[PDB]
Amino acid sequence: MIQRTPKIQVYSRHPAENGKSNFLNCYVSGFHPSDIEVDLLKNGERIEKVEHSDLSFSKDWSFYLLYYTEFTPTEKDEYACRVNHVTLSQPKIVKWDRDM
Amino acid sequence: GSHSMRYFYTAMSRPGRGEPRFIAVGYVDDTQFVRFDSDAASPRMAPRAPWIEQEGPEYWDRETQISKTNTQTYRESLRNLRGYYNQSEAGSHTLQRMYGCDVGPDGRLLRGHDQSAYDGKDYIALNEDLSSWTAADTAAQITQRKWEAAREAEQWRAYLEGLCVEWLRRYLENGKETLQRADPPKTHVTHHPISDHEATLRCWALGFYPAEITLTWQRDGEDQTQDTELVETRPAGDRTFQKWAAVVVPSGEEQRYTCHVQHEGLPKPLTLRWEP
Amino acid sequence: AQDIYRASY
């Protein structure tokens, strides 16, 4: 069988403004099979209180999940999403960039 | 507007880690309204939208019973499919089903759906006539013959033309304040220098519902399809969605570019430009 | 509301 590797986007729920509490999102999609490991990171370290959406899938049968947690962006703090899947030999890290 | 109800079933085997997990979720358009997970501590079909909570205990009992039955039967189906493809008991496999109905503005049936995939590959689908199937391969032909013998298409037609649309109309009315409200995108254009020679113009759409949207760039009125980076529409976590479209433009040529936005929530389509 | 179970694959 053919497997599909995840697409990953990292972004906030509301427009980012430093000092204001917001939600950090990591949307993983387009993958198959459904098992997947996702971590949200703050300055390289795993955030503990992360929830995710219920597993569902798109018309093309690929799966998608939204991982999310409260965060307060600042100028210096770095956030990222770390994803592992059977299709990846190592974890893939995507940095949060408020411009994307 | 037009609307859909869909149920999404996923069954996933995991040899050596217990019996296959079964998950069922229901949607009206892009709004999830029920969920079931056989791995839950107390498996139950549970509400996920406020407007379904008013259904009574008999509703929850029925929906839970169906899900609990399917937990068992989709495990049989996974055993059957393993055999149909001469597969080892050692491997993990996935069976997915999508089904439901679409209606137009008048609440009338547009069409019904019931289709399935095995390990992410299309397996069998009910044709739009709700009378016959398209089987992907000789394995799915076994399923087809079995379902033909059991007069399954007739039963599916009766559900899709009857209860499916009746429930969907009920849900649309009980949830009308949200389900029949389209929230337009909030739009803006940002400018990101790449070098002395070029910059990115990024056209944003935020806060819209439902997810369906069209976001394009033109240069001198010509669509820039091949040269536009278009990200997948993504959920914000507040029911709404986000999308952006970007083009790389030569320095000083920005006003040749226009972003165009179409969405059900808009009085009329938008045209936007970089506004330094 | 869901359709009922009737037939396995």
Residue numbers in the entry:
A (entry chain B): 0 to 99
B (entry chain A): 1 to 276
C (entry chain C): 1 to 9
Authors' account:
In the endogenous presentation pathway (MHC class I), abundantly expressed intracellular proteins are processed by the immunoproteasome and proteasome to yield short peptide fragments that are transported into the endoplasmic reticulum and assembled together with the MHC-I heavy chain and β2-microglobulin light chain (β2m) by the peptide-loading complex. The resulting peptide/MHC complexes (p/MHC) are further trafficked through the Golgi and eventually displayed on the cell surface, where they are surveilled by CD8+ cytotoxic T cells (CTLs) through specific interactions with αβ T cell receptors (TCRs). ProTECT analysis of 106 patient samples from the NBL TARGET cohort identifies a recurring “hotspot” mutation in the ALK protein (R1275Q), together with its specificity toward common HLA alleles. Specifically, two putative peptide sequences with the R1275Q mutation, a nonamer and a decamer, are predicted to bind HLA-B*15:01 with high affinity according to consensus methods.
The nonamer complex crystallized in the P212121 space group at a resolution of 1.7 Å, while the decamer complex crystallized in the P6122 space group at a resolution of 2.6 Å. The nonamer peptide adopts a canonical extended conformation promoted by the N-terminal (Ala1, Gln2) and C-terminal (Tyr9) anchors, which are deeply embedded within A/B, and F-pockets of the HLA groove, respectively. This anchoring results in a “curved” conformation, where the backbone of residues from Asp3 to Ser8 is pushed toward the upper part of the groove while the remaining residues are maintained within the C, D, and E pockets. Thus, the X-ray structure of our ALK-derived nonamer neoepitope is consistent with established structural features in the PDB, suggesting a trend where the peptide backbone conformation is defined by its length and anchor motifs. Here, both neoantigen p/MHC samples show a clear unfolding transition with a highly reproducible Tm of 53.4°C for the nonamer and 59.3°C for the decamer complex, suggesting that the decamer forms a higher affinity complex with HLA-B*15:01. Notably, the buried surface area (BSA) between HLA-B*15:01 and the decamer peptide is 1,986 Å2, relative to 800 Å2 in the nonamer structure. In addition, the decamer participates in 25 polar and 21 hydrophobic interactions with the MHC residues, while the nonamer forms 26 polar but only 11 hydrophobic interactions with the groove. A structural superposition of the nonamer and decamer peptides (2.7 Å backbone heavy atom RMSD) highlights the changes in residues that are oriented toward the solvent, suggesting that the two epitopes display very different surface features for interactions with TCRs. To further explore the basis of this exclusion we performed structural modeling of the self-peptide/HLA-B*15:01 complex, using our solved X-ray structure of the nonamer complex as a template.
